[PDB]
């Protein structure tokens, strides 16, 4: 599964050194659900790369869970490479137009 | 009683009523004058071509500075009649609308004269809404744009009727509100 | 919530400009009323 | 609060510059009474402080004229 | 009508306020316009009620007397506190300090009495301060008090018997509403109240018989700025011109259409304006 | 429709100023008996 | 004239410049390409489908609008009095001197002379 | 009365309408408009001809 960092839907937060991520309940008392999301260089604009782990949680990620518990999935979530949502552009050599 | 009255039995009861009529009058005064000064219309220097400040520029203070981009049409109307106005008008601006507009924000001149339909447009969009036309919309020697066609052509009668079709159906109103639109218009 | 109530509240700036007027009253008179007092009193 | 307390100082100083008569208690009634209307030592300060009321007391009015027209 | 007696052969030229539009442009050969104008509505003025009525405007008659009575209570609140430690004069002490005049008498004595008097002055100040403000905003915002504006969904939308819209039969304005199908409602009413001469229908507006008149802007601006007591609502919602007329195949066509232009340059058409369509204001 | 001016009868605004207004008598009630033991 | 007839370079990517625009050569071998748009242009488009034209354009150079110089005209009025064109659209005004040698149409936008000052 | 007129005509802000305001159409310098690149919106503004 691929995703993208968007504020009110799916969050990206650094991992605790102990490998896990912090678990603070909601106001309703129920425990928040979170999953380990791998992904990009941890610093996007200028760097070769650093594929480091993260911890994600949010609206969609929750909808991912319930859907899973009704389909018997097994998922590995990773952020998208270059952040952009996606469109098709006519690259150089004018021959093929691919979806960036 | 009145001396007592203006701001410091049946005898005293009346001068009271006068004291009353003070605050009712005064408050009503300061109110009225508020609405009168909250009406935003202010006099602008000149009031037409016929005015003296244009006609005989030999006043003590230097004349209004007269900019018209030359070799156009507004020239051929000024030179034709107002000999004195023209011979003073060799000190001008020569970079058309752009020169006139900057030179006027920076005090290089004080008056400008050009075709009407581009002036009350350029003044329509302008940072801060800091320009106006002294006519309050007035126009002089009013004519209009056209489509110059060869003399005695056979094309004329056709596109002469396809124009009167557009204006007469408001289809030209759709254009005028797309390309001639300003912020400063309704303010 | 959305409110934008009252297009003002008189700043603590212009009143300072009003406060400056009375301040000059406090500073000025004493110096005159004290220093000049030595003159008109004795002779 | 500033106008409340900055008023309260000209209450204090003026009886000091006048006691050296006017009762200590008495001086307090006149000044507030002054800023509210109704009652070279006493005069010099009370003169300009009197207008000082008229200056802002008239702006308050002007202010309400805005708060009642731009709403 | 008038366009007929030219096309039939009874006259060779038509010098009158004739408009310019497609239909007549088929059969007549116009000239260059010699005046520009529009279309605008004429309505009867609305009265600026009075001063005496406005002087009580923020006096909404609810607090106007709630305070008119509560002035008395403090009077009987001090002497009834003073008699316990004169009364008739205390009733002359409120109505003075309230109106801030110097029409009073001896002041209250007790220290408590001093505290009581002082707040009354404070209450008084806020009242007149509130009054002078509320009246001002009552004068700026209640500016228009005007009749219907231009035609943007006013009472024009419903052909009730409250409003009556009129024109003159056999005009451009008449035709202009017929071809417009987007304004079908606007015309079905207009048929029932059309008039016969532009002059007699003006009289109807000065007679509270006719509410709105939709006609030219040149004739109908002089008509307001000169007669009196009549005003035209807003901007103009159409733009046209005037012009001489002449039959097809006329020799004069090319020549007269120069003079009309040659005179716009010489300020001639300007002063004819300054002669008898302006400088006649009410 | 042409009724916009909005002349305001704000009885609560009035009830606003009446707060410091009537309690002035409430400042006297607390100063009416405070004088009796004081004058005695 | 900026609000009426605008000129703009073509989109280097697409190659043939944006629709809703009309291509317009420039009188002067490599005649540089650039396409026009604006109010006066949008007239002759709507005018083309009602009287069935076909049309090219070309921005004149020699002279701005057109006046008389020692007995020969320049500018747009030049390009019509000398059979080098059939129309001349844009910001052109009517008056007497012009209308003696070249016909005209009915005015579709009104104008005049005006005065502009600072606030 | 003259003080009040000045305090009334210090009109702070009349920010914007929807996307039809003349501030939108003619972007001289004021009110520059910016979207996220390559997004579904930046294509919607290339497909509408107006
Ligand atoms: C329109 O006016 C022109 C200018 O006056 C007329 O041209 C003149 O016509 C007379 C009539 O024979 C000639 O003798 C003149 O020589 C013409 N002028 C010039 C400069 O040659 C013209 O005739 C008028 N139009 C009509 C229909 O009479
Ligand atoms: C204006 O016309 C004059 C006279 O022909 C000419 O010399 C000049 O180059 C033209 N243009 C400008 C900008 O003055």
PDB file of N, CA and C in Angstrom, chain H residues 9-39:
ATOM      1  N   UNK H   9     -14.117  55.624   8.727  1.00  0.00           N
ATOM      2  CA  UNK H   9     -13.517  55.365   7.427  1.00  0.00           C
ATOM      3  C   UNK H   9     -12.129  54.744   7.526  1.00  0.00           C
ATOM      4  N   UNK H  10     -11.803  54.113   8.654  1.00  0.00           N
ATOM      5  CA  UNK H  10     -10.640  53.235   8.753  1.00  0.00           C
ATOM      6  C   UNK H  10     -11.064  51.776   8.546  1.00  0.00           C
ATOM      7  N   UNK H  11     -11.645  51.520   7.372  1.00  0.00           N
ATOM      8  CA  UNK H  11     -12.177  50.204   7.049  1.00  0.00           C
ATOM      9  C   UNK H  11     -11.047  49.193   6.876  1.00  0.00           C
ATOM     10  N   UNK H  12     -10.944  48.223   7.790  1.00  0.00           N
ATOM     11  CA  UNK H  12      -9.770  47.338   7.810  1.00  0.00           C
ATOM     12  C   UNK H  12      -9.607  46.449   6.585  1.00  0.00           C
ATOM     13  N   UNK H  13     -10.607  45.625   6.269  1.00  0.00           N
ATOM     14  CA  UNK H  13     -10.428  44.556   5.295  1.00  0.00           C
ATOM     15  C   UNK H  13     -11.745  44.136   4.652  1.00  0.00           C
ATOM     16  N   UNK H  14     -11.696  43.977   3.328  1.00  0.00           N
ATOM     17  CA  UNK H  14     -12.782  43.459   2.503  1.00  0.00           C
ATOM     18  C   UNK H  14     -12.301  42.296   1.647  1.00  0.00           C
ATOM     19  N   UNK H  15     -11.679  41.298   2.278  1.00  0.00           N
ATOM     20  CA  UNK H  15     -10.673  40.390   1.706  1.00  0.00           C
ATOM     21  C   UNK H  15     -11.077  39.918   0.309  1.00  0.00           C
ATOM     22  N   UNK H  16     -12.124  39.107   0.155  1.00  0.00           N
ATOM     23  CA  UNK H  16     -12.343  38.473  -1.140  1.00  0.00           C
ATOM     24  C   UNK H  16     -13.754  37.912  -1.257  1.00  0.00           C
ATOM     25  N   UNK H  17     -14.188  37.653  -2.486  1.00  0.00           N
ATOM     26  CA  UNK H  17     -15.374  36.861  -2.777  1.00  0.00           C
ATOM     27  C   UNK H  17     -14.946  35.431  -3.077  1.00  0.00           C
ATOM     28  N   UNK H  18     -15.855  34.658  -3.661  1.00  0.00           N
ATOM     29  CA  UNK H  18     -15.448  33.404  -4.272  1.00  0.00           C
ATOM     30  C   UNK H  18     -14.538  33.668  -5.457  1.00  0.00           C
ATOM     31  N   UNK H  19     -14.341  32.656  -6.295  1.00  0.00           N
ATOM     32  CA  UNK H  19     -13.485  32.929  -7.439  1.00  0.00           C
ATOM     33  C   UNK H  19     -14.352  33.511  -8.550  1.00  0.00           C
ATOM     34  N   UNK H  20     -14.694  34.789  -8.412  1.00  0.00           N
ATOM     35  CA  UNK H  20     -15.150  35.590  -9.537  1.00  0.00           C
ATOM     36  C   UNK H  20     -14.720  37.040  -9.364  1.00  0.00           C
ATOM     37  N   UNK H  21     -14.000  37.328  -8.302  1.00  0.00           N
ATOM     38  CA  UNK H  21     -13.690  38.717  -7.998  1.00  0.00           C
ATOM     39  C   UNK H  21     -12.703  39.273  -9.021  1.00  0.00           C
ATOM     40  N   UNK H  22     -12.815  40.556  -9.365  1.00  0.00           N
ATOM     41  CA  UNK H  22     -11.845  41.142 -10.299  1.00  0.00           C
ATOM     42  C   UNK H  22     -10.413  41.087  -9.805  1.00  0.00           C
ATOM     43  N   UNK H  23     -10.200  40.901  -8.503  1.00  0.00           N
ATOM     44  CA  UNK H  23      -8.849  40.665  -8.009  1.00  0.00           C
ATOM     45  C   UNK H  23      -8.289  39.369  -8.580  1.00  0.00           C
ATOM     46  N   UNK H  24      -9.150  38.374  -8.773  1.00  0.00           N
ATOM     47  CA  UNK H  24      -8.718  37.111  -9.360  1.00  0.00           C
ATOM     48  C   UNK H  24      -8.301  37.287 -10.812  1.00  0.00           C
ATOM     49  N   UNK H  25      -9.209  37.795 -11.648  1.00  0.00           N
ATOM     50  CA  UNK H  25      -9.045  37.696 -13.095  1.00  0.00           C
ATOM     51  C   UNK H  25      -7.790  38.413 -13.579  1.00  0.00           C
ATOM     52  N   UNK H  26      -7.546  39.628 -13.089  1.00  0.00           N
ATOM     53  CA  UNK H  26      -6.385  40.406 -13.503  1.00  0.00           C
ATOM     54  C   UNK H  26      -5.324  40.354 -12.418  1.00  0.00           C
ATOM     55  N   UNK H  27      -4.366  39.444 -12.498  1.00  0.00           N
ATOM     56  CA  UNK H  27      -3.387  39.300 -11.416  1.00  0.00           C
ATOM     57  C   UNK H  27      -2.152  40.162 -11.613  1.00  0.00           C
ATOM     58  N   UNK H  28      -2.274  41.480 -11.437  1.00  0.00           N
ATOM     59  CA  UNK H  28      -1.146  42.353 -11.742  1.00  0.00           C
ATOM     60  C   UNK H  28       0.053  42.037 -10.858  1.00  0.00           C
ATOM     61  N   UNK H  29      -0.032  42.371  -9.573  1.00  0.00           N
ATOM     62  CA  UNK H  29       0.877  41.812  -8.581  1.00  0.00           C
ATOM     63  C   UNK H  29       0.087  41.366  -7.364  1.00  0.00           C
ATOM     64  N   UNK H  30      -0.955  42.122  -7.039  1.00  0.00           N
ATOM     65  CA  UNK H  30      -1.694  41.892  -5.809  1.00  0.00           C
ATOM     66  C   UNK H  30      -2.413  40.555  -5.858  1.00  0.00           C
ATOM     67  N   UNK H  31      -2.446  39.876  -4.716  1.00  0.00           N
ATOM     68  CA  UNK H  31      -3.156  38.614  -4.592  1.00  0.00           C
ATOM     69  C   UNK H  31      -2.643  37.582  -5.588  1.00  0.00           C
ATOM     70  N   UNK H  32      -1.392  37.154  -5.425  1.00  0.00           N
ATOM     71  CA  UNK H  32      -0.822  36.054  -6.196  1.00  0.00           C
ATOM     72  C   UNK H  32      -1.451  34.761  -5.703  1.00  0.00           C
ATOM     73  N   UNK H  33      -1.689  33.837  -6.624  1.00  0.00           N
ATOM     74  CA  UNK H  33      -2.435  32.622  -6.338  1.00  0.00           C
ATOM     75  C   UNK H  33      -1.561  31.402  -6.572  1.00  0.00           C
ATOM     76  N   UNK H  34      -1.580  30.474  -5.623  1.00  0.00           N
ATOM     77  CA  UNK H  34      -0.657  29.354  -5.624  1.00  0.00           C
ATOM     78  C   UNK H  34      -1.374  28.083  -5.203  1.00  0.00           C
ATOM     79  N   UNK H  35      -1.152  27.016  -5.960  1.00  0.00           N
ATOM     80  CA  UNK H  35      -1.751  25.727  -5.655  1.00  0.00           C
ATOM     81  C   UNK H  35      -0.611  24.731  -5.475  1.00  0.00           C
ATOM     82  N   UNK H  36      -0.912  23.467  -5.204  1.00  0.00           N
ATOM     83  CA  UNK H  36       0.107  22.434  -5.074  1.00  0.00           C
ATOM     84  C   UNK H  36       0.361  21.829  -6.442  1.00  0.00           C
ATOM     85  N   UNK H  37       1.631  21.765  -6.833  1.00  0.00           N
ATOM     86  CA  UNK H  37       1.985  21.328  -8.175  1.00  0.00           C
ATOM     87  C   UNK H  37       1.490  19.915  -8.452  1.00  0.00           C
ATOM     88  N   UNK H  38       1.222  19.646  -9.729  1.00  0.00           N
ATOM     89  CA  UNK H  38       0.926  18.298 -10.215  1.00  0.00           C
ATOM     90  C   UNK H  38      -0.328  17.701  -9.584  1.00  0.00           C
ATOM     91  N   UNK H  39      -1.071  18.483  -8.817  1.00  0.00           N
ATOM     92  CA  UNK H  39      -2.251  17.990  -8.130  1.00  0.00           C
ATOM     93  C   UNK H  39      -3.441  17.987  -9.073  1.00  0.00           C
TER      94      UNK H  39
END
